[PDB]
Design a protein around this ligand. Structure first.
Ligand SMILES: OCCOc1ccccc1
Length: 162
């Protein structure tokens, strides 16, 4: 297991434009296109992302290209965030994956605001952090995934991803 295999499980792979769990146009391995309800706006974002006229459809190679960019961008975002960087750097590699997973799904600005969870994670109070992480919209809206990510934060193992 690694961050790519983890997010591949959590996000799936679809080659045609679809709506994510929040109802937003997405493609590939959880590549959010736009929050616009206009399919044409999503198609424009897709074509811009891929660099050709896609007509709402991409290849597996293209999906994987966006995925690598998105994972990279998530990590670099964490590293430039003054609240997230020290916590991220305090973690072991497996728990870092859980952190990347959350940021990939929820975005950096929101996650940087989870002040109490962040503190518990930096303190390595794992069971407390796990309890705190579940007290969230995130957990309520995507509980199966959140349980996996939380187990990863709690244990520093890949037990939830087998
Ligand atoms: O909800 C707690 C998120 O924990 C993180 C820790 C480090 C970087 C990003 C997230």
């Amino acid at each position: 297991m690694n961050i790519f295999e983890m997010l591949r499980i959590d996000e799936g792979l679809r080659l045609k434009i679809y709506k994510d769990t929040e109802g937003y146009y997405t493609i590939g391995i959880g590549h959010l296109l736009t929050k616009s309800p206009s399919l044409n706006a999503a198609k424009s974002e897709l074509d811009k992302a891929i660099g050709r006229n896609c007509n709402g459809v991409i290849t597996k190679d293209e999906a994987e290209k966006l995925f690598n960019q998105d994972v990279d961008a998530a990590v670099r975002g964490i590293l430039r965030n003054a609240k997230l960087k020290p916590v991220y750097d305090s973690l072991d590699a497996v728990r870092r994956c859980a952190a990347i997973n959350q940021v990939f799904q929820m975005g950096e600005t929101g996650v940087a605001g989870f002040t109490n969870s962040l503190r518990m994670l930096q303190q390595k109070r794992w069971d407390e952090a796990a309890v705190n992480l579940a007290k969230s919209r995130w957990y309520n809206q995507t509980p199966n995934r959140a349980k996996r990510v939380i187990t990863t934060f709690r244990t520093g193992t890949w037990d939830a991803y087998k």
